[PDB]
């Protein structure tokens, strides 16, 4: 689901993922840290640029 | 007189009488704690 | 183990501001602006919330259940 | 001149680079030559005033002018300790299976403020652990955590898996004694904040207990203190010895609080002036600027006390200040009665 | 049994007295010291705490002439009570008219 959201949009909201997947906060954080970085006032951004 | 204990992983109420080898049904675990007392206890908020 | 109800120095009620604080961390808020939004002006309550470790759920993972 | 120095000594508290000066109250009869500092009730009643500047729920701010440091400190200390309130003292525990220890749980429960009005109760007598309708309150806390019968297959979050896994203070239910149900309308007696996290549970664990609350003063224990923070500060009065203009005026605006010094273009050039000296906190950053050290004179008005009273929600802070003043009056009356009995 | 007088010595001189006040602390001690020091007939007024463990204070009053040093004590208590009443009235008026102008 996280990867599909990243395909759909470059920015992913952590709270939305937590709500949709019903998963705990730390598991969502582990999912995001593998492929995303925190950008303040914008959420989580994909770590690599569009190639 | 029903003496009741709680095993460490089943957490099920087991009634065992005196001089019984400590075990539990639906397990084999052998740490058998005692349930909390029913007597009222008064505590001070200090 | 768990968040203290009162701030140690001043005495402001800080126990009820813990989980909401986590929500602000579940949101995009930084630590400082989340503390500001919670209304902790003096730095003692900010130290209370910022330096607290939530060991209660880790201990509950070892609870009998 | 000498008269100006005497007036500054007896009216102002100056903050130097390394230390404060003129901190002691000195207006006493015989202390000064050209001044009659003997007590005058009429003069004090003329000069004294109270001005409320900000007041919402659980927060009050007001300036008192004409009072001295001793009386202001007495009011602050009475508010901090000598104002009686309602708080939990006794905890009777029936089958506490929670991870939180019984003594820790009781200590946490004691710190929870209670919205009951303390004036309507009396101090419980020495002993008398049973308590009567007049001088106690009872709160029932019974939370049994169990698995949610309907949940998702994964349900990683404890909220979906479990119910009553967080024992909030809203689970506390008031148990009326005697005729307290008639005297107090429903909803008046309750925990103040309604959201304080008391403990955390897992299925199977249960917390069943009763709480006896009795009247008490903050001097006995800090859980009885009504005010979160009751403090006072002397009103600052920043003065400019010489007119500061140019970019150095902007430097002045950056040395102090953002809202105290304002720069204006009277003739197209920026000149600084004191706008709101109240907003200053005296970070004393003007002393870092070598040039600007000798152009300002930071000071506090001796007889101008801004009181900030942030309460815990037991009752509105204005009633708290009234109760503090009445407690000081009661102490004075008690000692006058003792003196009369002696003579 | 709360406030007890103690004269300067066995001679029982009324010029120098010590009032021991029970279950009291720096609040009343300091306020009363301020209110009684303003009396012109008091040479020396001063309170101290015997020990932080026990809740009692010792006020000492030494007058100039032949005052019994109990009259300044009663006068200071009365002045403090009157001041407290006046500040209570003024604060209530300020709160009330602040509320009225708010609405
Ligand atoms: Zn078993
Ligand atoms: Zn604090």
- The CATH number linked to C61 is 1.10.10.60
Q: Which residue has the tokens 């395909």?
A: A7
Token pair for A51: 């190639």
Q: Which residues surround ligand 1, an ion (CB under 5 A)?
A: B 7, 10, 24, 27
Q: Which residues pair with D310 in a beta bridge?
A: D229
CB contact under 8 A, A15 and C26: yes
Cβ-contact D227, D320 below 8 angstroms: yes
Alpha carbon of A32 to ligand 2 centroid (Å): 34
> Looking at the complex, does the CB of residue C63 fall below 8 Å from at least one CB of chain B?
no
Number of domains comprising chain B: 1
Three-state secondary-structure class, residue D245:
strand
Q: Which helix or strand (DSSP H or E) is residue D74 part of?
A: helix D69-77
DSSP H/E element including D334: helix D317-342
D113 contact residues in C (CB cutoff 8 A): 13
Ligand having the closest approach to the CA of C49 = 2
**Nearest bound ligand to CA B8?**
1
**Candidates A15, A19, A24, partner chain D, best to mutate (most D CBs within 10 A):** A24
> Which residues in D278-311 are b (16+ Cβ under 10 Å) and which e?
bebebeeebbeeeebeebbbbbbbbbbbbbbbbb
Please state, in angstroms and rounded to a whole number, the distance separating the CA atoms of residues B12 and B5.
8
Question: What tokens appear for D64 in the block?
Answer: 């008192």
Ligand 1 center from residue B9 Cα (angstroms):
6
Which residues share a beta bridge with D308? D61, D231
CA-closest candidate to residue D32, choices D2, D1, D68, D71:
D2
Rounded-to-integer distance, Cα D312 and Cα D310, Å: 7
Chains touching E (at least 3 CB pairs under 8 A) are D
**Both structure tokens of D238:** 């920043």
Does the beta carbon of C27 lie under 8 angstroms from any beta carbon of chain A? Answer: yes
Rounded to whole angstroms, the Cα distance separating E18 from E20 reads 6
D159 touches chain A (CB under 8 A): no
Chains A–D, number of C-beta pairs less than 8 Å apart: 13
Say if residues B32 and B14 touch (Cβ distance below 8 Å). Answer: yes
Other Cβ atoms closer than 10 A to C29: 17
Distance to chain C for D218, nearest Cα, Å: 12
* Phi and psi at residue D146, to the nearest 5°: -150, 160
Q: Which residues of A touch D157 (CB under 8 A)?
A: 18, 22-24
Question: Closest Cα to residue B13, out of B35, B37, B38?
Answer: B35
Nearest alpha-carbon partner for D278 in D240, D309, D239, D235: D235
How many residues are recorded in chain A?
51
Looking at the complex, does the CB of residue A37 fall below 8 Å from at least one CB of chain C?
Answer: no
Task: Assign residue B16 the CATH number of its domain.
Answer: 2.20.28.30
Say how far apart CA C22 and CA A18 lie, in whole Å: 13
- In Å, how far are B21, D11, D35, D159 from D3, measured between CA atoms? 97, 12, 11, 73
Residues from chain E that touch D35, judged by Cβ atoms under 8 A, are none
Quote the domain boundaries for residue D218. Answer: 82-228
D101 vs D109: CA distance, rounded Å: 12
- Counted domains in chain C: 1
- Residues sharing a CB contact under 8 Å with residue D11, sequence separation 6 or more, in sequence order: D301, D302, D303
Q: What gap in Å lies between CA E39 and CA D39, rounded to an integer?
A: 7
CATH assignment of the domain containing D126: 2.170.120.12
CB C8 within 8 A of CB C23: no
User: What are the backbone angles phi and psi of residue E10, rounded to the nearest 5°?
Assistant: -65, -20
Q: Which domain holds residue B40?
A: 3-46
Question: Domain of C18?
Answer: 1-65
Residue E39 tokens read as 């009396």
Q: Give me the residues paired with residue D88 across strands.
A: D213
Judge: D160–A22 Cβ closer than 8 Å, yes or no: yes
Q: Kind and range of the H or E element at D3? A: helix D2-11
Query: What is the spatial distance between Cα D108 and Cα D106, in angstroms, rounded to a whole number?
Result: 5
> Which ligand gives the minimal distance to the CA of C10?
2
Q: Spell out which residues of chain D touch residue E79, defining contact as CB-CB under 8 Å.
A: 39, 41
């Amino acid at each position: 689901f996280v990867m599909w959201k990243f395909t759909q949009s470059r920015w992913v909201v952590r709270k939305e993922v937590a709500t949709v997947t019903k998963l705990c906060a730390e598991d969502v954080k582990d999912f995001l840290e593998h492929m995303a970085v925190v950008r303040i006032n914008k959420g989580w951004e994909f770590i690599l640029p569009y190639d | 007189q029903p003496m009741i204990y709680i095993c460490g992983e089943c957490h099920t109420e087991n009634e065992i009488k005196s001089r019984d080898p400590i075990r539990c049904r639906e397990c084999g675990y052998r740490i058998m704690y005692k349930k909390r007392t029913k007597r009222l206890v008064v505590f001070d908020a200090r | 183990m768990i968040i203290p109800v009162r701030c140690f120095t001043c005495g402001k009620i800080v126990g009820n501001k813990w989980e909401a604080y986590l929500g602000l961390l579940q949101a995009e808020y930084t630590e400082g602006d989340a503390l500001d939004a919670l209304g902790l002006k003096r730095y003692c309550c900010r130290r209370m919330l910022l330096a607290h470790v939530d060991l209660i759920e880790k201990l509950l993972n070892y609870a009998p259940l | 001149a000498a008269s100006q120095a005497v007036e500054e000594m007896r009216s102002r508290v100056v903050l130097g680079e390394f230390g404060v000066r003129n901190v002691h109250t000195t207006d006493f009869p015989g202390n000064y030559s050209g001044y009659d500092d003997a007590w005058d009730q009429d003069r004090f009643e003329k000069n004294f005033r109270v001005d409320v500047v900000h007041m919402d729920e659980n927060s009050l701010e007001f300036d008192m002018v004409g009072i001295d440091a001793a009386i202001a400190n007495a009011f602050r200390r009475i508010l901090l300790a000598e104002v009686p309130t309602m708080a939990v003292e006794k905890v009777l525990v029936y089958n506490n299976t929670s991870i939180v220890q019984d003594e820790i749980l009781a200590h946490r429960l004691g710190l929870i403020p209670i919205h009951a009005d303390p004036r309507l109760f009396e101090y419980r007598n020495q002993g008398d652990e049973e308590g009567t309708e007049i001088d106690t309150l009872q709160f029932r806390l019974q939370v049994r955590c169990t698995r949610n019968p309907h949940a998702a297959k994964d349900s990683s979050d404890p909220n979906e898996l479990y119910v009553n896994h967080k024992v909030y203070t809203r689970h506390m239910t008031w148990i009326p004694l005697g005729n307290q149900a008639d005297l107090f309308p429903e909803g008046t007696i309750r925990p103040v904040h309604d959201d304080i996290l008391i403990a955390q549970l897992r299925p199977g664990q249960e917390i069943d207990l009763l709480m006896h609350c009795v009247k008490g003063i903050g001097k006995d224990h800090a859980k009885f203190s009504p005010v979160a923070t009751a403090s006072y500060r002397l009103l600052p009065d920043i003065t400019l010895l010489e007119p500061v203009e140019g970019e150095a005026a902007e430097e002045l605006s950056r040395c102090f609080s953002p809202g105290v010094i304002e720069v204006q273009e009277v003739q197209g050039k920026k000149v600084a002036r004191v706008a709101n000296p109240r907003l200053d906190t005296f970070s004393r950053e003007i002393f870092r600027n070598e040039k600007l050290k000798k152009v300002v004179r930071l000071a506090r008005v001796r007889d101008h006390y801004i009181f900030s009273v942030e309460s815990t929600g037991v009752l509105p802070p204005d009633v708290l200040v009234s109760e503090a003043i009445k407690v000081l009056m009661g102490k004075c009356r008690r000692f006058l009665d003792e003196l009369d009995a002696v003579q | 049994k709360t406030a007890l007088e103690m004269v300067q010595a066995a001679g029982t001189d009324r010029h120098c007295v010590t009032f021991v006040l029970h279950e009291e602390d720096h609040t009343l001690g300091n306020s009363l010291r301020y209110m009684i020091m303003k009396n012109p007939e008091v040479e020396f007024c001063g309170y101290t705490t015997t020990h932080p463990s026990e809740s009692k204070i010792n006020l000492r009053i030494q007058t100039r002439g032949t005052l019994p040093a109990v009259e300044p004590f009663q006068r200071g208590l009365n002045e403090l009570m009157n001041v407290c009443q006046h500040v209570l009235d003024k604060f209530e008026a300020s709160i009330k008219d602040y509320k009225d102008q708010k609405a």
